[PDB]
Write a protein that binds this ligand. Structure first.
Ligand code: HEM
Ligand SMILES: *[C@@H]1O[C@H](CO)[C@@H](O)[C@H](O)[C@H]1NC(C)=O
Ligand SMILES: [Ca+2]
Ligand SMILES: [Ca+2]
Length: 343
């Protein structure tokens, strides 16, 4: 199908998403940047999608419908759930685009998380399928993990939601590579999970492995533990998945291994996007998503930030020694904050 703009797609229904694409690249991602709104849109996919529970269906029935746009349709209800803190603003921003283009909330959330990732260097080539009907009921609370849940709790939650195993839990957490936290530390917003929040790379996995030495802002916040780097926040679930015997070697496997990071996250992100859906009833519009850019310099893919070395690593994978990475030159730095979006 040749769209009105001359670009070819498989299904002509996909042609409409080019207009959506142009509208959000300009009016929501500020010219296709991998910054706050891109990060917020990647996060939204997870909070929409994971709220599904076959377990619950079998007992206290409606476990939620997954990737159905419910968090936007019933936003007053769902974004008030404490694990969904801060998403009322993200939904408020996305909602006008859904309303004017007449696309379903589910497909837009899926579209905007794929586009947001195509804006981050190093991102996999992202997929996009359309076909999610609007939710008719809000997800129950209790389905989105908290940063203070136990490793056993998260493994069980993810397993229930879509039969993901604990290796796949580590893969989807790759998204904290292009991410900041606005709401855990009440004194500062935009503290990144890693030193490169606009780059999809394995620095999240290198840096959560350092011994925790400092709080970036205040201490005593529920769900936060020390990081080993100034300006960087570390949440407790990420801290302990890095060290736990079930996930420690998978955590570490990403260090210095870009192709594994990318191929695993391409896969797992599409799977989140299809929770509660039948893939065989969806239309592939991956042709609309723009090509992801390479990570631009000529550096090592993974490294130790200035002032860190192998001595700072808390070796948790017993089978494989932590790789020998270069330490970048210079004294220790402070990772800069990404201010959250206006409104
Ligand atoms: C065990 C599950 C997870 C936990 C406990 C967790 C927890 C968190 C927390 C506490 C924040 C900050 C929220 C705030 O301050 O408002 C955060 C941010 C984020 N998370 Fe997760 N997360 C998990 C899984 C995921 C997954 C699987 C993805 C999606 C593919 C994801 C993507 C993000 C992104 C991109 C952000 C940054 C949002 C922004 O910059 O505005 N998270 N996560
Ligand atoms: C990256 O991971 C893949 C999949 O486990 C593995 O086959 C490959 O050898 C790893 N690459 C490096 C550079 O170790
Ligand atoms: Ca949902
Ligand atoms: Ca990163």
């Amino acid at each position: 199908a040749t769209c009105a703009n001359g670009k070819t797609v498989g299904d002509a229904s996909c042609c409409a998403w080019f207009d959506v694409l142009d509208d959000i690249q300009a009016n929501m991602f500020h010219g296709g940047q991998c910054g706050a709104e891109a990060h917020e849109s990647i996060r939204l996919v997870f909070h929409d999608s994971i709220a599904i529970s076959p377990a619950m269906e079998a007992k206290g029935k409606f476990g939620g419908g997954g990737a159905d746009g419910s968090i936007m349709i019933f936003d007053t209800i769902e974004t008030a759930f404490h694990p969904n803190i801060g998403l009322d603003e993200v939904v408020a921003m996305q909602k006008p685009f859904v309303q004017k283009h007449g696309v379903t909330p589910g497909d837009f959330i899926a579209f905007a998380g794929a586009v947001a990732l195509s804006n981050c260097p190093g991102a996999p080539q992202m997929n996009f399928f359309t076909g999610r009907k609007p939710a008719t009921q809000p997800a129950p609370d209790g389905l989105v993990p908290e940063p203070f849940h136990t490793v056993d709790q998260i493994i069980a939650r993810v397993n229930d939601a879509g039969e993901f195993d604990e290796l796949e839990l580590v893969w989807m957490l790759s998204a904290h590579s292009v991410a900041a936290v606005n709401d855990v530390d009440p004194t500062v917003q935009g503290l990144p999970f890693d030193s490169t929040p606009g780059i999809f790379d394995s620095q999240f996995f290198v840096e959560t492995q350092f011994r925790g030495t400092l709080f970036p802002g205040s201490g005593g916040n529920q769900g936060e533990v020390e990081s080993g780097m100034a300006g960087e926040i570390r949440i407790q679930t990420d801290h302990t998945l890095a060290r736990d015997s079930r996930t420690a070697c998978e955590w570490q496997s990403f260090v210095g291994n870009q192709s594994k990071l990318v191929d695993d996250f391409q896969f797992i992100f599409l799977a989140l996007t299809q929770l509660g859906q039948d893939p065989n009833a969806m239309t592939d519009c991956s042709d609309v998503i723009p090509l992801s850019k390479p990570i631009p310099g000529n550096g090592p893919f993974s490294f130790f930030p200035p002032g860190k070395s192998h001595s700072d690593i808390e070796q948790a994978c017993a089978e494989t020694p932590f790789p020998s990475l270069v330490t970048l030159p210079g004294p220790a730095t402070s990772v800069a904050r990404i201010p959250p979006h206006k409104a």
